[PDB]
Ligand binder design. Sequence first.
Ligand SMILES: *[C@@H]1O[C@H](CO)[C@@H](O[C@@H]2O[C@H](CO)[C@@H](O)[C@H](O)[C@H]2NC(C)=O)[C@H](O)[C@H]1NC(C)=O
Ligand SMILES: *[C@@H]1O[C@H](CO)[C@@H](O[C@@H]2O[C@H](CO)[C@@H](O)[C@H](O)[C@H]2NC(C)=O)[C@H](O)[C@H]1NC(C)=O
Ligand SMILES: *[C@@H]1O[C@H](CO)[C@@H](O[C@@H]2O[C@H](CO)[C@@H](O)[C@H](O)[C@H]2NC(C)=O)[C@H](O)[C@H]1NC(C)=O
Ligand SMILES: *[C@@H]1O[C@H](CO)[C@@H](O[C@@H]2O[C@H](CO)[C@@H](O)[C@H](O)[C@H]2NC(C)=O)[C@H](O)[C@H]1NC(C)=O
Ligand SMILES: *[C@@H]1O[C@H](CO)[C@@H](O)[C@H](O)[C@H]1NC(C)=O
Ligand SMILES: *[C@@H]1O[C@H](CO)[C@@H](O)[C@H](O)[C@H]1NC(C)=O
Ligand SMILES: *[C@@H]1O[C@H](CO)[C@@H](O)[C@H](O)[C@H]1NC(C)=O
Ligand SMILES: *[C@@H]1O[C@H](CO)[C@@H](O)[C@H](O)[C@H]1NC(C)=O
Lengths: 245, 93, 48, 257, 49
Amino acid sequence: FAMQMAYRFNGIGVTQNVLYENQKQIANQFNKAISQIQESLTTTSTALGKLQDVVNQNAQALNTLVKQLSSNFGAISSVLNDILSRLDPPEAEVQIDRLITGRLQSLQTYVTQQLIRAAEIRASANLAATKMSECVLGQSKRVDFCGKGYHLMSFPQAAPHGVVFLHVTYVPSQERNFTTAPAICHEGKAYFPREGVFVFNGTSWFITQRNFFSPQIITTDNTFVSGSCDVVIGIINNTVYDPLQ
Amino acid sequence: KFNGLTVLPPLLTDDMIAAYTAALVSGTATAGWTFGAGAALQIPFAMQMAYRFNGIGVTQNVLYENQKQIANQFNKAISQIQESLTTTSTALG
Amino acid sequence: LITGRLQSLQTYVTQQLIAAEIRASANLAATKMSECVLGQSKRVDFCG
Amino acid sequence: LTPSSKRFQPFQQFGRDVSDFTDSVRDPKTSEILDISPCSFGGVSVITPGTNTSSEVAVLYQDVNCTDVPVGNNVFQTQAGCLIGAEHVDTSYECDIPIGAGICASYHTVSSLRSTSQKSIVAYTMSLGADSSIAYSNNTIAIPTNFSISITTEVMPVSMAKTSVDCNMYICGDSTECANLLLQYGSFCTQLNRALSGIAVEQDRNTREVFAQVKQMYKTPTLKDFGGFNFSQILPDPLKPTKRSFIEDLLFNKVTL
Amino acid sequence: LLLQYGSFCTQLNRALSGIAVEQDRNTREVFAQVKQMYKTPTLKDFGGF
Ligand SMILES: *[C@@H]1O[C@H](CO)[C@@H](O[C@@H]2O[C@H](CO)[C@@H](O)[C@H](O)[C@H]2NC(C)=O)[C@H](O)[C@H]1NC(C)=O
Ligand SMILES: *[C@@H]1O[C@H](CO)[C@@H](O[C@@H]2O[C@H](CO)[C@@H](O)[C@H](O)[C@H]2NC(C)=O)[C@H](O)[C@H]1NC(C)=O
Ligand SMILES: *[C@@H]1O[C@H](CO)[C@@H](O[C@@H]2O[C@H](CO)[C@@H](O)[C@H](O)[C@H]2NC(C)=O)[C@H](O)[C@H]1NC(C)=O
Ligand SMILES: *[C@@H]1O[C@H](CO)[C@@H](O[C@@H]2O[C@H](CO)[C@@H](O)[C@H](O)[C@H]2NC(C)=O)[C@H](O)[C@H]1NC(C)=O
Ligand SMILES: *[C@@H]1O[C@H](CO)[C@@H](O)[C@H](O)[C@H]1NC(C)=O
Ligand SMILES: *[C@@H]1O[C@H](CO)[C@@H](O)[C@H](O)[C@H]1NC(C)=O
Ligand SMILES: *[C@@H]1O[C@H](CO)[C@@H](O)[C@H](O)[C@H]1NC(C)=O
Ligand SMILES: *[C@@H]1O[C@H](CO)[C@@H](O)[C@H](O)[C@H]1NC(C)=O
């Protein structure tokens, strides 16, 4: 499991060392987070209305239909048998025809609105399958599709008529200002940092990634030479340490 | 107001929509692509442009070496789109 | 009169409901916001 | 009726608008035209907090120029109309039960009636968000130092309650006189049945689509731990006869039926 | 006669009202994807852009 988490961090821009050195606290926080989800759904909080709402109208829809049956449309008698019993077949036929027309109309109302809801459920559920394939199965670089911020992984939970996703996501914090420059002029020759940003803590400059402040000595491998110093805007003077030197 | 008709004004008015758009653009200007991920963090715009190229497939050196030209062309582009939407167009159709 | 005007309003309501395309466009707009406005998109042809 | 300004043709008397309703009528005594409109026909609406919270209520009518509604406190006139029993306050919050047109109403501790705290319903213009400050320094970057993990619930519907109906029983309900008059109406309920049947099988396929992306039924691990991480809730506990997640055991109950 | 008819009024109003609330809901999703309003920077130009 640790391997998988480390590679997933590599899928986010943070290097393996972070996970292999902070597994203790990070798993602690993971267990915590699972616990807060447990309690959050445990209370009477109804943050499942998206799964609730749908069934409601179903019943409501059915109710309308049922109640509409009790209703008589241009009909003296709502129940047909009284219409049969009360009048001559010719005029009773007119009454029956009115009732049939109206009831059939109600049936069309029901069927049309049901098709519409079927279409909506179709769109939602195709989204559901896409979320299943893109989040749970694989770490997605696509932002906000699975969860806010960078995506670590996902987990499904079946619920009546629907699915409830849990997203394990990464969120940085504890901001710090730093003085930075686009590039470094080493010996009259510009250098550009690779997969990293130059920073200055106040004493000397350093190289670090975006989402975890870790200073490293600027080295030949950590950069590549390209173009003269002059062309670069805002380039600064410094030295690059050469390990083999 | 015609024999039973009514239109309901939107919950958000156009002004707050414009304010949201302004905030979005300002954020993309200052904090870059990060503020979509949780909190915002401030980045120089040249930094963010170079990072975006390194995302696309060329190293940051090209962008920094040719910053002036890309800036000019970007300004010309916003200019020509300004002119195009200035002209009566079917883009809104 | 009741029969005709009722079915007429019914037809209007049905067409207005056929709203769904607008909603789908809205959802794609939301994804377009989140995925390109808020960051780089390695997916091709989705944005420009 | 209001005085009319847009002129008429001298011989022409009556004016009917685009929809041919009378925009104006020329007075027969004095050949002067009067603009004609239908006047307000409002839709009554109620704002009400939780009955647990209170019983005081507010109302809105959309068709209002406050004068042109019979009897209010300070009746606060919005483009949505003017409401009763609340007060406009110049503070701003996140929006609450929304009036619209820039107005949101909340059951708030009044905070204006001193310490009585009548918690009166109050309307306000919403706060788009908490203000944030930032300065663009051409050579200053911001870096985070501390990583956090917060897991959030997403909820997505996938199915439909699979329902079916017989045409004959719904429309007629067991009168032999029917299905003859009904038969005259052709094949209606035939497609009215086929459509729902196709819908039903379509949701069934959808359910299989959403969940059965699996390759094979992998065996559930015995130990519930993994390298320190805890999964105990999401996995099905072998001990529990439910053979489902504690989370799902909770979930089946939380939804109300 | 409408009273003799059944609740058609109710279904129509419910459907259209749901349409309206749906519309406002879509608008909010599309535009409200930011947690904090950011003050517009005073200088419109950055780094030559
Ligand atoms: C700023 O960078 C300097 C240069 O590395 C840091 O000074 C070193 O700090 C480490 C940490 O214990 C020591 O092992 C080294 O001996 C220090 N070197 C020198 C020359 O003093 C300094 O700690 C950094 N400060 C901050 C706030 O980041
Ligand atoms: C980086 O160092 C180089 C070498 O010292 C600087 O180049 C010259 O520095 C001298 C300082 O004695 C200046 O008088 C010259 O005008 C510089 N340019 C020449 C000789 O062409 C360079 O200016 C330094 N850059 C920074 C940003 O410190
Ligand atoms: C992020 O901040 C938290 C809050 O303090 C850190 O958590 C504690 O950190 C201190 C020292 O760093 C430890 O002594 C405690 O044991 C930590 N407690 C918990 C519950 O985590 C956390 O370490 C910080 N992140 C990193 C990477 O250091
Ligand atoms: C994994 O987490 C579960 C749930 O938090 C732990 O089970 C709980 O253990 C405590 C301590 O004995 C009990 O008080 C709870 O009643 C248990 N709850 C459930 C649902 O079993 C479990 O011990 C943890 N396991 C590991 C290896 O961390
Ligand atoms: C550091 O960042 C804070 C934002 O929290 C800002 O108010 C402050 O002015 C910054 N200071 C420097 C020296 O950049
Ligand atoms: C950065 O800004 C400061 C003050 O606004 C200015 O003095 C300096 O020349 C600028 N440098 C670059 C590289 O933009
Ligand atoms: C309408 O008739 C009255 C009664 O004779 C007369 O006084 C008035 O001037 C007339 N108005 C006209 C002709 O506009
Ligand atoms: C409401 O009536 C007042 C008084 O006549 C008027 O000043 C105001 O413009 C009216 N507002 C409307 C019609 O919206």
